[PDB]
Design a protein around this ligand. Structure first.
Ligand SMILES: CCCCCCCCCCCCCCCC(=O)OC[C@H](COP(=O)([O-])OCC[N+](C)(C)C)OC(=O)CCCCCCCCCCCCCCC
Ligand SMILES: CCCCCCCCCCCCCCCC(=O)OC[C@H](COP(=O)([O-])OCC[N+](C)(C)C)OC(=O)CCCCCCCCCCCCCCC
Ligand SMILES: *[C@@H]1O[C@H](CO)[C@@H](O)[C@H](O)[C@H]1NC(C)=O
Ligand SMILES: *[C@@H]1O[C@H](CO)[C@@H](O)[C@H](O)[C@H]1NC(C)=O
Ligand SMILES: [Ca+2]
Ligand SMILES: [Ca+2]
Lengths: 180, 180
């Protein structure tokens, strides 16, 4: 009956876990079997690696019925390791009829090495306002962060970010914050 | 007898104090009269303004004799306000025969509003190794710093620098740290 789909594309799944196959999360508005026993499923998930700064999810409401998504919580539980996870979409919106990519960003601050715990609480509502899908209650996700080490180091009180670029202050630019 | 000159060019003097005249500091290897009573002179100097991120000094050893300069201390006494002052020259070098510009940088961190105290201790030595000129002993300089306020603010745990640019982390770019 249902028309809702949520999945990780074959390409994104390959960079993440090594297998170039679509990972189905929701098919025809029903959670995939692996997500039924969430705690068993989660214990097979390693922390997101340092080389992964963001993850692409694909979703669609493939029918004539309208669906509404809402990001209730985008929260880092280790703010000194990683800032709040981000989404490249409005927090409340319609699930698109055309399959579209939602990028979840994992902003490691670059000040500390470590594993940051975080939440991505999202609900899907039908046109009656009822919640029909949602992140499993109390779900925790993990991201591995590394301390930034820029080539040569950032001068003029500049800090190195996790993309190996110098974060330069007042009238200071260049690869190591030298120019004016 | 002396050949050493140090001064602030007319243009730099205009943006700094409002008067488009060269400010002579050292002429023919002799400190300018105003620098004799350093404490009286210093009390007429306001903290460097927020709109000034760096200052240009011009120097030359206009004769055949060689002179050597050495920056002994480039230190901020308020590290949380401003990082250590910088120079765009090697710390030990020869004073050029051709008049050349030395840029002293004042790197306000953008985290705090306030006045930062700092030191610029430099000596000039002749070819016998004797110090013939130097910053007056225990000299303190001041720079006004402002807390950075980027238009819209820096997302993804990014910080705003004092040149109103977003300092973006891991796989995050753009005007407010949004893109990947
Ligand atoms: C748009 C983003 C939404 C969704 C936002 C919530 C999650 C976003 C958080 C980002 C962090 C998640 C990454 C987890 C870390 C990781 O390494 O993932 C491991 C697995 C690798 O996949 P795997 O080892 O194969 O697991 C599946 C195996 N099968 C079943 C295919 C045989 O990858 C996975 O197993 C997939 C993990 C996704 C499971 C989360 C389920 C929550 C879904 C909420 C559904 C309700 C609302 C949406 C409905 C349209
Ligand atoms: C290359 C950088 C070196 C030099 C590095 C040391 C200093 C660098 C520190 C940066 C901060 C200094 C800025 C001071 C803040 C300020 O607002 O400056 C105010 C004055 C404005 O100028 P003014 O009000 O006219 O003062 C002179 C008035 N007259 C005499 C012309 C009538 O501007 C001035 O009065 C000029 C201030 C410079 C006085 C410092 C004297 C120390 C000189 C050391 C000499 C020894 C070694 C070099 C010899 C070649
Ligand atoms: C994620 O999706 C964006 C959107 O086009 C794409 O540019 C990027 O290459 C994708 N990344 C992966 C690992 O598939
Ligand atoms: C300082 O000197 C540099 C070197 O060319 C010049 O580009 C800059 O415009 C000068 N600034 C002032 C205020 O004179
Ligand atoms: Ca660094
Ligand atoms: Ca800001």
């Amino acid at each position: 009956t249902g028309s809702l789909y949520l999945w990780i594309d074959a390409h994104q799944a390959r960079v993440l876990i090594g297998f170039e196959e679509d990972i189905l999360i929701v098919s025809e508005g029903k959670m995939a079997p692996f997500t039924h026993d969430f705690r068993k499923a989660q214990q097979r998930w390693p922390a997101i690696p340092v080389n992964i700064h963001s993850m692409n999810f694909t979703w669609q409401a493939a029918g004539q019925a309208e669906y509404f998504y809402e990001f209730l919580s985008l929260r880092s539980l280790d703010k000194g390791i990683m800032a709040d996870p981000t989404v490249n979409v409005p927090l409340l919106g319609t699930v698109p009829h055309k399959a579209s990519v939602v990028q979840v960003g994992f902003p490691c601050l670059g000040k500390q090495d470590g594993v940051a715990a975080f939440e991505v609480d999202v609900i899907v509502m039908n046109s009656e306002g009822n919640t029909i899908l949602k992140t499993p209650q109390n779900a925790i996700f993990f991201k591995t962060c590394q301390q930034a080490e820029c080539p040569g180091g950032c001068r003029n009180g500049g800090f190195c970010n996790e993309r190996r670029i110098c974060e330069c202050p007042d009238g200071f630019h260049g690869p190591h914050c030298e120019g004016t």
